[PDB]
Amino acid sequence: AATGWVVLFVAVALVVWFVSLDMRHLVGPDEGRYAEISREMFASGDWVTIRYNALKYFEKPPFHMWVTVVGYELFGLGEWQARLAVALSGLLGIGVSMMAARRWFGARAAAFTGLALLAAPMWSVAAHFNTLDMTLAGVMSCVLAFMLMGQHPDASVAARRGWMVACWAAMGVAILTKGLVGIALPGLVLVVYTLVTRDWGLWRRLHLALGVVVMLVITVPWFYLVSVRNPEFPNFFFIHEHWQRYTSNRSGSVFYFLPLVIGGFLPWAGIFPKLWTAMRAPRFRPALMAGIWAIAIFVFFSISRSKLPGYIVPVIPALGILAGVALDRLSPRSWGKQLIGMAIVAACGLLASPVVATLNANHIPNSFYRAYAVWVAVAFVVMLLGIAVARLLLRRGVLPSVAVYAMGMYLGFTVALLGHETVGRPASGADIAPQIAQKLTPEMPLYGVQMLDHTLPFYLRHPLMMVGQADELTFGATVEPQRVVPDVDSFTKLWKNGQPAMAVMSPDTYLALAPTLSMYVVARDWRRVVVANVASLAGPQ
Ligand SMILES: CC(C)=CCC/C(C)=C/CC/C(C)=C/CC/C(C)=C/CC/C(C)=C\CC/C(C)=C/CC/C(C)=C\CC/C(C)=C/CC/C(C)=C/CC/C(C)=C/CC/C(C)=C/COP(=O)(O)O
Ligand SMILES: [Cl-]
Ligand SMILES: [Cl-]
């Protein structure tokens, strides 16, 4: 019965979902870093010791790199293979959240959750950005939604056991993805829920024994292996990456995530208060569980000393579920108010498009941002078209109007995402990679002279040899000093009478080494100067 409109929708949703992965180049630092770590883990076969540019990188656990390496084995190297983990994680969050919503609030509310998570710019945009935030958010989305599945009164005891074992295994994979936060956050949400509901017997329906066992038999192996092979791992990873990161100064104010939420859930901002109403009318209270999820995690990261915008992505799935509740209780006129208001907001975004033509960040010229403002404006135009067609279909019902609205928003923010290619392409250094690879060999060193390039070594398929300040590889540079040049003088002596090699540096570094070290330019970029010691690997000078 009119299912062809759904199927087509999903089709139009899925194609744009995957093609958008390969529409733009990798942008630093996260995408190039994790793509390169996955590349080295893929070429070396060592899936235990995480390495970045041949140095140890013990700042993250390796589930994301495992998924991406599988993507490299099945689909080769490339951009969409690097974004495949966060893509499948976004699809996972949408699907499993829709499953929980359908189990609890019905099929229509589940459809509204799918439209809400599909239109949310943080979920759709973050699902195409190669960073561990989206994968953690999808896995923890399986955590929350499985918790909602097992705690259903109409579910059998075997069903509750299955969903709870899958929940503990889910949060286990979560801590295997981004550390102890995948067990700390859901436990905190559970504590707050049991505090406001006074339902302590809830803890009896969790299967702590079997669940804890299933979690340990999946998280303990890698930590034990990388801890035995590298005794310095647990102190750094558990102390410096959690306690020093949360309790001590990526800083910011308390309200640092206040706009990032309102921005990350912009198309549904008009129903932000109604979401709270969903927590009033959810034994077990699911909508209150999702609200305590979003509020608990939001407060947890709002008081952290280290803040990055991707921290609060896990709150989007729960925030989506509540959305699917609110949109389900709306009359046609009530949605009309949303179409009007969001039409005004999108029109304001369209009038505010020329602002991008004034910015120049990360030492990127103003021309690329002048080209970016065009795609921003086109994006807001797509949003206005989707809102218009949604108003045209409002007479057909609230569900199809919300469907066209969410499709227009998703296409719009997708256009705004692909428009960033105009700025990311000159920064990715992919244009000079062919000119470099014509002379560079795998046996040749590529000295990163006081510069940690995240995107160039990937497109070159060639690690760096850190020279001077190694930045986030300093630890790896100190544990294994044989793979790193400590100061610049050793780089000079390795350059003059050393082996044939190339060097990536900043233009200022080139101007500093020019009066002393004789070097010939191999490739020049807006942020990179790539030189060689022998005059054979360059051209004319
Ligand atoms: C109810 C539902 C839905 C499901 C059911 C749930 C269920 C079954 C639950 C049953 C499970 C159960 C017995 C729960 C029992 C109840 C419970 C709370 C147990 C806790 C879990 C256990 C045992 C041990 C964990 C030990 C700790 C210290 C936990 C934290 C305790 C909490 C909460 C708040 C304290 C506040 C502080 C000072 C935290 C610092 C540590 C962290 C965590 C720092 C991360 C900050 C950060 C900034 C991280 C960024 C990561 C990162 C590397 C960013 C890098 O960023 P870039 O690289 O730059 O991108
Ligand atoms: Cl209203
Ligand atoms: Cl980009």
Torsion sign across C-alpha atoms 321, 326, 331, 332 = negative
Least Cα distance to 97 among 319, 321, 297 occurs for 321
DSSP classification of residue 536: T
Looking at the DSSP assignment, which residues form a beta bridge with residue 51? 56
Torsion sign across C-alpha atoms 171, 176, 180, 185 = negative
* Distance in Å, CA 275 to ligand 2 centroid: 12
Pocket test for ligand 1, best of 148, 188, 247 (most atoms within 8 A of CB): 188
Least Cα distance to 25 among 117, 130, 123 occurs for 130
Q: How far apart are CA 285 and CA 537, in angstroms?
A: 68
Looking at the DSSP assignment, which residues form a beta bridge with residue 448? 466, 504
Q: How far apart are CA 411 and CA 386, in angstroms?
A: 9
The ligand whose atoms approach the alpha carbon of 274 most closely is: 2
From the CA of 301, give the closest atom in ligand 1.
Answer: 48
Closest residue by Cα to atom 41, ligand 1, is 242
Paired tokens of 5: 């409109």
* Distance in Å, CA 316 to ligand 2 centroid: 22
C-alpha angle 488-492-495 in degrees, rounded to nearest 5: 130
Q: Where are the domains of the chain?
A: 31-329, 331-428, 433-532
Token look-up 């599909």 returns 118
304 lines ligand 1 (CB under 6 A): yes
Least Cα distance to 424 among 27, 125, 19 occurs for 27
Closest residue by Cα to atom 52, ligand 1, is 178
520 lines ligand 1 (CB under 6 A): no
183 lines ligand 1 (CB under 6 A): yes
Number of neighbours of residue 439 by Cβ within 10 angstroms: 17
Q: How far apart are CA 91 and CA 97, in angstroms?
A: 10
Q: How far apart are CA 108 and CA 116, in angstroms?
A: 12
From the CA of 247, give the closest atom in ligand 1.
Answer: 38
Closest residue by Cα to atom 35, ligand 1, is 184
* Distance in Å, CA 433 to ligand 3 centroid: 17
User: Phi then psi for 503, rounded to 5 degrees?
Assistant: -140, 130
270 lines ligand 1 (CB under 6 A): no
From the CA of 180, give the closest atom in ligand 1.
Answer: 43
Torsion sign across C-alpha atoms 434, 440, 442, 447 = negative
C-alpha angle 351-425-122 in degrees, rounded to nearest 5: 55
The ligand whose atoms approach the alpha carbon of 180 most closely is: 1
Q: How far apart are CA 221 and CA 224, in angstroms?
A: 5
Least Cα distance to 295 among 312, 278, 309 occurs for 312
Q: How far apart are CA 155 and CA 476, in angstroms?
A: 50
Contact 19, 6 (CB under 8 A): no
Q: How far apart are CA 501 and CA 486, in angstroms?
A: 17
Which value in Å is the resolution of this experimental model? 3.2
* Distance in Å, CA 510 to ligand 1 centroid: 45
**Inter-CA distances, 367 with 168, 243, 356, 468, 470, Å:** 50, 42, 10, 33, 31
* Distance in Å, CA 273 to ligand 2 centroid: 10
H-run or E-run covering 443:
none
Pocket test for ligand 1, best of 183, 200, 241, 308 (most atoms within 8 A of CB): 183
| Cβ-based neighbours of 466, under 8 Å, separated by 6 or more | 53, 55, 447, 448, 452, 473, 477, 483, 484, 485
Closest residue by Cα to atom 34, ligand 1, is 184
Contact 541, 524 (CB under 8 A): no
Token look-up 């046996």 returns 443
Contact 528, 506 (CB under 8 A): yes
Looking at the DSSP assignment, which residues form a beta bridge with residue 56? 51
User: Phi then psi for 232, rounded to 5 degrees?
Assistant: -85, 0
Indicate the Cα dihedral angle 276, 144, 317, 65, nearest 10°. Answer: 150
Task: Tell me the helix, strand and coil percentages in the chain, rounded to 5.
Answer: 70, 5, 25
Contact 510, 412 (CB under 8 A): no
